[PDB]
Amino acid sequence: MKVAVLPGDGIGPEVTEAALKVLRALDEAEGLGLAYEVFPFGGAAIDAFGEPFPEPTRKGVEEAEAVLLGSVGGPKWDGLPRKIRPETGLLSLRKSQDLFANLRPAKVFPGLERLSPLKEEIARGVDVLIVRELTGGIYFGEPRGMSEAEAWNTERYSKPEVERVARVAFELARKRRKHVVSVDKANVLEVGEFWRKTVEEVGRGYPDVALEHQYVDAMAMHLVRSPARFDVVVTGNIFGDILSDLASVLPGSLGLLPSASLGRGTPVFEPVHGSAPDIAGKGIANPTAAILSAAMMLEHAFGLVELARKVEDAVAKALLETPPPDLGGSAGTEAFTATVTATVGI
Amino acid sequence: MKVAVLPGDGIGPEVTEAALKVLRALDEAEGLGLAYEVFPFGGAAIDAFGEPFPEPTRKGVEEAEAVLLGSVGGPKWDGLPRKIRPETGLLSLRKSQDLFANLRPAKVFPGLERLSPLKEEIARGVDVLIVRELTGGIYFGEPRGMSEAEAWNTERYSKPEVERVARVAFELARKRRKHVVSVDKANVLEVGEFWRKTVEEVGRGYPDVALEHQYVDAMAMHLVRSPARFDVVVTGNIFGDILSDLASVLPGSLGLLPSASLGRGTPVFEPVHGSAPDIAGKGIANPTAAILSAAMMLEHAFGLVELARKVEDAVAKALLETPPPDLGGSAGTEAFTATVTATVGI
């Protein structure tokens, strides 16, 4: 269990350490042989090496089995050349490991339905995993450009690209509730027909997984109307950007959202939240997102499904009995973390 | 008041008639000189002419000052060549009248918050008007196409296109609550920067209207988390498709959503719902959408703002007194129409 830890900026370092205390207690009580090394990344790397992704950290991630990343970026570096700013580092890390599938789950823990913008009866049970293609689509498609008279961008997709995301989505569904919803705009766009047909062929190799297809517009309605019926959802870059943000509001607090990036190389698990400079080091930060990110790591990097679920359960229990400030509670980083460990240990 | 009525298929004919009763009453007790002739359109046209947009209907539209359209399409015609299917008749209609702005309001009437997927406190007050560009974007952008190895589609936009839809949005804001939110993807795509910049210039001629910009992914979250703060929203074709559908779930029943298409030619007003072939003619269909569509027609096609709002407010009064089956009530098409007529006459 080789973990390259990239704590990052702002509250990253401290929430990441919260996640590590949880892992260290699990590894100690169950003997998981966890081994990790922390490497400089983000602004932290910029300030100590002149760039976001320094060689040592590059090698550090190649050699690890998984990467636990904290928050990256902050006002202190947003004014540097694009090619050396934090967000850039994330670009080169993802690319160095050929990561093409962004994993964004959204789950309403039992008893926390009240937090949802949705009515209670419709929030209950939500547990959807949104898989978003990262390497291509209109976000990268060419030609792109703009004149004084007009602008253009191209939504382009190759079969290999759709195929790899699709595969990851089916695999994921297997170890889940065996359902996959592939979302596209096939009723009007060629790339939607192509995507649809590709995901269809690929799904043939996964008979044990029920494959449903829906349109993006229809999907947006479905995630507010009845999100609880979906398990895994896969779709291209932009629709994936929109659908995961949509699903992200379902639970009701950003500080809970974990995330993962799977690909050909080393998998990256990190919180969705930002660095939150103004509260860094004040021990207020809700570590939930980083912990759940460590939980996603256990499961997807090391196939420890049951234990991961054990960590998730414990954090769900903690947000109920000792909620952190952002949930209207008074449990700070340190205290919340102990609660989670307890609920894991008991 | 020349109104070309295109009843369509399924429950279109019957909800259209319900809207007609309401107009007839209003034109009788107010002497508005309502004149109208019904023309074949959709499957109804295919079955009696061999196409969805026959010549008589084409001339009917150019000669009228507005078009009140019912439901178009159904299983009975989905299997025909694209060029003559119902959905294609709408395409040709839109284009015959160079209609470039699609108006889709979504409103939670007071007392009907329970109906919404959203919690009570968030649904209360929603009254958003989504304006979607119809004539261009990726939906029609070239190059488009697909090979065995890949597929591509182009999101393209010219200044005039963005300009005309923007204007429409500002005008509409003026007569409303004076606020417009232009939605794009300007922090990643050139068309997004070009769209932002163009709506910016256009807005300069509308100082009285507060112009806010938001990203589509951000907008999806905003619509679920706090829709009540929006007034008018404008954006391109595809994002417009998605955001309208997302906002459309807010009221908690598709049977209430009216819609309109404005442009250089005859305006079209029609409900958002489908033809519902299984309950067609059973007098169960909720006419609300068709009536509100007739109310939008009075306002936009003939400038009778106050009257239209009289229709809307009667409609809202009815949904409370005698709700239709889709609101968990037992008021059929005929009976609910009476109720509306009543609150409008009272």
Residue B126 buriedness (CB in 10 A; 0-12 / 13-18 / 19+):
buried
Q: What string of DSSP letters covers B225-282?
A: H-GGG--EEEE-HHHHHHHHHHHHTTTS-GGG---EEEESS--EE--SS---GGGTTT
- Any idea how long chain A is? 346
Catalytic annotation present for A157: no
**Cα end-to-end distance, chain A, whole Å:** 24
Indicate the domain borders of chain A. 1-346
Q: Dihedral of CA A222/A177/A127/A121: which sign?
A: positive
Please tell me which of the candidates A117, A152, A190 has its beta carbon nearest to residue B144: A190
Neighboring chain A residues of B141 at a CB cutoff of 8 Å: 152
Identify whether the C-beta of residue A130 lies closer than 8 Å to the C-beta of residue A168.
Answer: no
CA distance B180 to B158: 21
How would you classify the pairing of strands B127-133 and B99-107? antiparallel
The question of whether B326 is a catalytic residue gets the answer: no
Judge: A155–B158 Cβ closer than 8 Å, yes or no. Answer: no
Q: CA dist A294 to A19, A41, A101, Å? A: 6, 18, 18
Q: Is B323 annotated as a binding residue?
A: no
Nearest to B320 by CA among B288, B291, B277: B288
How many Å apart are CA B87 and CA A128, to the nearest integer?
33
Q: Count contacts between A and B (CB, < 8 Å).
A: 144
Residues 6+ apart with CB under 8 A from A31: none
Q: Bridge partners of B105?
A: B129
Fold of A1-346: Isopropylmalate Dehydrogenase (3.40.718)
Contacts of A190 in chain B (CB under 8 A): 144-146, 151-153
| Cα–Cα distance list, B191 to A12, A139, B184, B241, B244 (Å) | 34, 11, 8, 17, 20
List alpha helices for chain B, DSSP H.
Answer: 12-28, 43-49, 55-63, 75-78, 86-96, 120-123, 159-174, 190-204, 216-225, 237-248, 288-302, 305-321, 333-345
Active-site residue identified among A27, A127, A241, A313 = A241
Could you give the CA distance from residue A139 to residue A154 in angstroms, rounded to a whole number? 8
β pairing state of B268-269 and A145-146? unpaired
Q: Specify the 3-state DSSP secondary structure of B101.
A: strand
CA B189 to chain A, closest CA, distance in angstroms equals 7
Residues B127, B245, B313, B326: which is the catalytic one? B245
